[PDB]
């Protein structure tokens, strides 16, 4: 495991009458600047 | 203005031409082909090398003949110019002179050496010169192996003609072989590739023969 | 009384026994009209097919979940499906297209709604199969994300990208822009539910080649 | 997130809350293709309507006397009466024509026949009435005489000549070329009687203006 | 006639709870930069 990331509330969402009740969010992992990969190897998966 | 164009002198360029005056046939090669307001004639080389050049095209070899040899007796095998392949592109020319490669491919279930020798003159030079092929340029080929040996041009006819089948001057050669080492089912396959050919004079494009 | 040749565009004329041409007395062949009865620039006519046009609007509602498809545009067949479009009449002759593409996605969201549509670009040979692609990875494509709030317009320029050198007009060969739901919209009450999406396109770097009979199809690359 | 305007030809786009555009990695927007898969010049497409076209052939026989009419061409409506002609598709949008004209009268007479046709040019407001004109005087017009013997082709260039500044496409406004019998032909036997006449036209100094719906007519000068 | 101008919907008006349902619009014809007028002439109208 690469480790947990936890997302918690500091301040609850404050919704207005003209405003939505709850919002939908998305996480994305972008690989870094310096990231190397090494020593190519086969795997059992198919089509990838 | 931009679109239109006019004569009356350059109507030669717009494609009007009198076939009755051709100059030399090679003079037509110099002729600038006609063009309208919009065409772009540009020579675009996609490959560095040219497949069109005589030197390159006949570099690719082509397969003439297959036979198994179970007998040590000297094998007469005659080489016609290529038919039914890209070698048939050479069918435009009668007179041909140049040295030619021979790629022979030895296949032996039981271990056998096989020998290759080439003679431009046929079996009969007026005497039977086939008594032993050792002295005529023999090159020995190991079992399960192949070699690239090329034959120099030795002929009493300075120019071979492609078309004719006449054994004297027409063919590009006649090939001799014999097995050694007390074997059978020694099978060979032989490939003929030209090297820096010189083709002289053209002929019309030959008819496909359905009736042979 | 000599040989006179005449060539315009594709056509050409080789005449024998020609006669010298005639023109009215004191002719003036200058094209433009000064003074001008028209304010337009005389290069309008050939330029005209490049004009930007409304393309394939779609309706994106609450109910549609993620990975759903709001609207679809088949790129090269999009600019002249009908006779009404400006680039149609001149594309009904020439059979090939080298043209580049400019598409500006128009969108309007009433302030107080939240969600995203994604405008991507999928070339034909890619478009052949949707089933292969993970959804979470579509951002690899040339694209632009569109936030509900604080985005009026999404401007994306697409260079010509296709297998064959030239592409057939009447076909789908350039592939097309497909607009996907990145996240559901969230509507407080009362609000209009349907958020209308209009893909307002354009075209640039115009090219045509290889003449054909007006209505007939012709194969080129295959 | 600022105001972004976009203008192409006639259309224009004024956007608020714009987003910076996107392009594929290492884009190359150069239009032309080198190496070339097409030998044609890329200016072909806009130039194409200028291409010279067969126009309204006619049959001139023995029986027809002098002052008779061999064939008739209504000039401006001549280049796109049908959908087949090259200049049609692009003239089906723009409603006005400033264009100049190039018409080359093609004719072939079997050696040993004698007679003449005259190729004249009559503008519209002139064409309204034939009845006024003496025949013997038609040579005042811009024209070319055509001898049976020793004339292959008759080349005449017509500059734009008309009352109003611009002329309507779909109408006859430019008038037209009318070909008349200057003297009867004389045929020895045996010979083919009918001498076929084909007016092989063209167009130059192309111009169009004033956009309209594709099929609808519009008044301008009247 | 000087010709039609047509006004159509690309995207319907999106109204909020704090926002009006429908808006009122106005067309105005401003005369151009270069516009000349010519050859003055009387008309049958009164007070103008």
UniProtKB/Swiss-Prot annotation, chains C, D:
Residue numbers of the full-length protein present here: 37 to 258 of 2253
Assembly behavior: Interacts with capsid protein VP1 and capsid protein VP3 to form heterotrimeric protomers. Five protomers subsequently associate to form pentamers which serve as building blocks for the capsid.
Free-text comment about domains: The N-terminus mediates the interactions among pentamers. In order to facilitate delivery of the virus genome into the cytoplasm, the N-termini of VP0s have to be released from contacts between pentamers and exposed at the particle surface, resulting in capsid disruption.
Organism: Ljunganvirus 1
Protein name: Capsid protein VP0
Protein task: Forms an icosahedral capsid of pseudo T=3 symmetry together with capsid proteins VP1 and VP3. The capsid is 300 Angstroms in diameter, composed of 60 copies of each capsid protein and enclosing the viral positive strand RNA genome. The attachment to the host cell receptor induces virion internalization predominantly through clathrin-mediated endocytosis. Binds packaging signals present in the viral RNA.
């Amino acid at each position: 495991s690469l480790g947990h990331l936890r997302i918690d509330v500091l301040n609850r969402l404050t919704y207005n009458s003209s405003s939505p009740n709850a919002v939908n969010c998305i996480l994305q992992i972008k690989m870094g600047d310096d990231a190397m990969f090494m020593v190519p190897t086969t795997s059992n998966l198919v089509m990838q | 203005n931009v679109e239109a164009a006019q004569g009356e002198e350059l109507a030669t360029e717009v494609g009007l031409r009198a076939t009755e005056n051709d100059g030399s046939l090679s003079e037509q090669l110099n002729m600038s082909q006609p063009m309208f307001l919009n065409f772009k004639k540009h020579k675009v080389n996609i490959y560095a090398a040219t497949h069109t050049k005589v030197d390159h095209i006949f570099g690719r070899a082509w397969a003439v003949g297959v036979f198994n040899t179970e007998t040590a007796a000297i094998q007469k095998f005659d080489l016609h110019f290529p038919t039914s392949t890209h070698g048939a592109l050479s069918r435009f020319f009668c007179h041909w002179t140049g040295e030619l490669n021979i790629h022979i491919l030895n296949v032996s279930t039981t271990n056998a050496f096989l020998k290759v020798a080439h003679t431009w003159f046929g079996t009969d030079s007026g005497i039977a010169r086939t008594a032993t092929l050792e002295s005529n340029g023999t090159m020995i080929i190991p079992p399960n192996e192949q070699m690239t040996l090329c034959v120099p041009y030795y002929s009493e006819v300075p120019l071979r003609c492609v078309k004719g089948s006449d054994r004297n001057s027409a063919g590009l050669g006649s090939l001799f072989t014999q097995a050694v080492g007390r074997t059978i089912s020694n099978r060979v396959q032989i490939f003929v590739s030209f090297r820096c050919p010189n083709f002289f004079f053209p002929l019309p494009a030959p008819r496909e023969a359905t009736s042979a | 009384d000599r040989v006179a040749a005449s060539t315009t565009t594709n056509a050409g004329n080789l005449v024998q026994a020609s006669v010298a041409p005639t023109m009215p007395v004191k002719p003036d062949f200058k094209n433009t009209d000064d003074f001008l009865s028209m304010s337009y620039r005389s290069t309008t006519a050939p330029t005209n097919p490049t004009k930007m046009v409304h393309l394939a609007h779609g309706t994106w509602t609450t109910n549609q979940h993620r990975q759903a498809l709001v609207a679809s545009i088949t790129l090269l067949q999009a600019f002249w499906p009908n006779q009404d479009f400006p680039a149609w009449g001149q594309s009904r002759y020439f059979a090939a297209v080298r043209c580049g593409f400019h598409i500006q996605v128009q969108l309007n969201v009433n302030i107080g709604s939240a969600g995203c549509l994604i405008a991507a670009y999928m070339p034909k040979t890619a478009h052949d199969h949707m089933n292969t692609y993970t959804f979470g990875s579509y951002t690899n494509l040339p694209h632009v994300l569109m936030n509900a709030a604080t985005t009026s317009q999404a401007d994306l320029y697409i260079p010509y990208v296709f297998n064959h050198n030239y592409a057939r007009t009447d076909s789908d060969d350039l592939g097309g822009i497909y607009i996907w739901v990145w996240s559901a919209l969230t509507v407080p009450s009362g609000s209009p539910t349907t958020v209308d999406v209009t893909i307002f396109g354009s075209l640039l770097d115009l090219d045509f080649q290889c003449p054909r009979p007006p209505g007939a199809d012709t194969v080129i690359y295959t």
